[PDB]
Symmetry: D2
Subunit: 331 residues, 4 copies
């Protein structure tokens, strides 16, 4: 299991923290470009999707321990501008999920794979699995099988399996139980998850300041259950920004880092203003980013370096007694 | 192409220099540990080989762009202490070559492969091929087929093929042309070589200072032919220490960096005396390394920065104009 | 190239003929089972699909040189009753194609791949690509890219690439023949890596006149000979899909095709549709209907192939090796 | 597990019998051609090795349920004449074992693999592992690790793992113990053996007729032990000829089949005399292979259909109740 540990080390910074940036947005980027161009979403050229993902990778790489890129857009647009020492998490789940009456059904991106991600020099495989424990049996069986089959692929190619879990509405107190029980399920050893991309159990807006107050301790107990499931499974957990205001998301992180979270995954929030208001003027997008998005990014990174417990690689290698034992054992 | 270019980017430092450290020594390290312990080479226990390679990774990994490690000894000994940002080149050649009257015959390490190197999260595959153009047709066709088969495996796994070429003496019971024709043959597109680990075409002691003189003009011309072959093929090249003294090896680099070379691969010079004179006192070995090998390493990196042309990853991406084309094309 | 040659040899009988049977039908079998049960298709239990596939493999494996199985239904249903000597072709395309206004877009079955077909012991990979030369540039670009990416997967795993081409209507016999023939001409290009072709009739089965010395016959045979010519130049053997044509009509399509160089056929729905539809789940009554009709049709098709089809022969065309180690070094 | 079961089905005849022919001989076939030409073993040409293996495949393939071919010699010589319906078993162990004083060390053929055997369309991988339970710990550990890593390769590529076990003399009733304890050791689930290729546990010449006698019962007890080990582990077993006389190998098979064996993997017994005597005339070798050599094989198959118990595939699959569960589970 060397590749999984080494792969996760390449996603964390020199200190062992996960200061990740998500740049795999497919419809969100297309929609942000439809607003910037003033044209309908169906008229936005592919060239525009590329120039936007190239600009974001150039702008946010030097302040990210690792970046999440999708294969069809960000990989051809910015693989040559992503620094070598920045970790590369490659998206595997297809954005066009099946919205059935009993819940959402996930599948991999066509003509892409865990094997291909390993081949292209990717450091980790990422899968977002829309999940809620109250889904129909058919939907629960589909999602569990999909996550499991990807976990098997990642074990086969010894590559870090990064599972992002998200609850959804069918086509606040209840939501917190739906989140925790989703985390508990995919923390089972059969799924082979190596890193959790988790959403907050309680909304960012509903969070009181960190204090000994009964209100704050009842909220911290929700985060504590998540952190307890992840420490027992041995899986580090980071947090999706979710679009919450920078201060609201900073509070989410203060609560999460107390319960044991090891980092964050920054989303749209960072650049959604710079892209919509200034594309295609590259220089103008970089100005709005250097004062808003990159500021928040450096702040979240500083909060992680201070409050978050660093992750450490767990290399419990077998006792290699003779020359050749390692090559045989690694099979 | 993407995995090979990004893999190569992880072997060079931030600026694009290959300041690599060879740490895959098998018989030389065993012989260095025999002298350090008093006992003969056949009595050196496996635990000492691990202990030695772990000290050498801990003390040199931070002052190296990438490190070449062997699978059976260095992988289980120091994979946990190899920095995530330091590139990892894994040895594929079996050190026990066949010394036939007509030349040396090479093969891969048993139970180890290009596929396994891609799996552990290795950035590059290293193969040492013993080669003399004047070898027998049997030995020539054996070495050619072995190097070509590894290039095919490296192309299949889209991982950089780092080929090391060495000139050797024939079996003896009781110099520049041989290097240039070795470099020329394997530079052909059938071998798929991505990085060269070449030796100096003229001895290190024989090298005159870089003068306008016809002696230095004819000596630099030998390096220029090596550099022109590497440049026409598109294969960057690095120089291996090969036992030269600090000043002797620095002249080789001063000559090669003007001829095109993109860096160095430092070997036994850095730690041979530090190991042989102080093993197994860790505090003593690290002290000896700082005042000698580490000092040389710092000077070689400074010389590489002052005179070596930075290598650039040439991503010759076949332009994609639609969502799905990248996944389909990457096959 | 060895694996593709051995794989192709295992899809044909020891004479060289492709007497193949298609058992990868997903919605057509679901509709047949809904009609047998007297319930809606969305009420058909998954166990009925397995019982049907298993019935059909045991029944038709006697008269078939190779069989086409789909991974999610046929493979769990009947891999244990598929004879070791009957070749195994595994379906890769998803039956749920994207029905865009500009044309149909294809994709692989989720969580199934060429690497898995090679791993499980499959002899060949099968992809059906919906194709029209006059479809939109985007749809054309998608289909060409999908076909080519599976051809690359098949070269990497050295396994035969069986490609089936089918024309369809968007959401004249000479106008259909142009759509069919120009589809064959495109995917015969070397970049696609096609090893075997599963083709529909360029001219309708009903329209075909008797194979005599008339002008009507030479005109019809010309379309078959253009298909036969494109395939012989590319080195791709071609078989014919029954496509729901009546037995007499399919035997006529085969006579025209075999004269043009076709090396066999792939029998679909025709063989078992009514048998399953009328008697499922009474296992015996299904076999009894199959023996009196479908199995008789397959025996006739196999006999016609033995007499009139040209035998496919393997051409290993291996580069000569002169030393021990050369073969292992060259196969990489 | 599907590919393993179907691969075993393809090595057996329509009635589950293993009537296999081995023509992967490297040193034994070399010695036969050296004797046929008068010249030493070191003088036998490569073309002579190819022609001989091509004759055996043309002559015997139609009367064998499956054949065992080696990559370097029998594969380029006869893959084009090997019938589609004859199972192809491909050798993997290097014939040049390491003959240490403590015992024999095994390795795979250079540049060949289980991955390549799957790729060429081979139905099974074959490894011969030289074994004695009384060899040194260094040798026992090596053979154990080599057998185990190939089992893991065959599990990864879901391909039958045919393991041949052979006792040998150390350099420069007791035999039954070396044979039976070898069988016992590699029947352990960790090795992932799918089919056994075993030598007789009692010398072929020492065997009395198959009568209800004390001598017969004593010998049959050594065969029954092998049968029980194999039957408990669920591993079918076939007996290798070992160059024994035809009448002797029929007695070895009668005892083996009465104890549960499912066939044979006969080599030199069938064709050694045809090649050793009449090489290099094509018509003469094919006359002695179709008349005398094929008679032995035809008799061996006749005894097998009469007395050997059929092998039956256990396709005990994990039951699926929905569309997509097979593809998810097959990972």
């Amino acid at each position: 299991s060397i590749g999984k540990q080494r792969g996760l080390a390449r996603l964390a910074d020199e200190d062992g923290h996960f200061t990740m940036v998500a740049l795999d947005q497919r419809p969100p980027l297309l929609q942000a470009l439809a607003k910037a161009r003033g044209i309908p979403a169906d008229q936005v050229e592919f060239a525009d999707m590329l120039a936007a993902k190239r600009l974001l990778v150039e702008a946010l790489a030097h302040d990210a321990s690792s970046m999440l890129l999708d294969p069809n857009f960000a990989m051809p647009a910015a693989i040559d501008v992503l620094p070598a020492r920045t970790g590369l998490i490659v998206t595997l789940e297809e954005h066009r999920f099946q919205d059935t009456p009993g819940g959402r059904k996930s599948r991999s991106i066509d003509n892409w794979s865990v094997e291909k991600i390993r081949r292209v020099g990717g450091d980790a495989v990422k899968v977002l699995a829309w999940y809620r424990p109250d889904a129909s049996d058919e939907v629960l069986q589909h999602q569990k099988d999909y996550v499991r089959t990807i976990g098997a692929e990642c074990r086969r190619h010894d590559i870090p399996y990064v599972l992002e879990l998200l609850v959804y509405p069918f086509p606040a107190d209840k939501r917190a139980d739906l989140v925790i029980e989703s985390v508990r399920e995919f923390a089972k050893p059969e799924y082979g998850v190596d890193l959790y991309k988790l959403e907050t159990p309680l909304p960012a807006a509903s969070l009181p300041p960190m204090d000994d107050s009964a209100e704050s301790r009842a909220a911290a107990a929700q985060f504590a259950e998540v952190g307890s499931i992840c420490a027992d499974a041995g899986i580090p957990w980071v947090l999706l920004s979710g679009g919450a205001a920078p201060e609201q998301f900073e509070r989410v992180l203060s609560y999460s880092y107390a319960a044991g979270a090891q980092g964050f995954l920054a989303g749209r929030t960072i650049w959604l203003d710079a892209v919509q208001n200034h594309f295609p003027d590259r220089e103008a997008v970089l100005t709005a980013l250097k004062g808003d998005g990159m500021k928040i990014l450096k702040d979240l990174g500083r909060l992680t370096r201070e409050k978050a417990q660093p992750w450490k690689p767990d290399f419990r290698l077998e006792q290699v007694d003779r020359e050749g034992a390692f090559s045989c054992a690694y099979a």
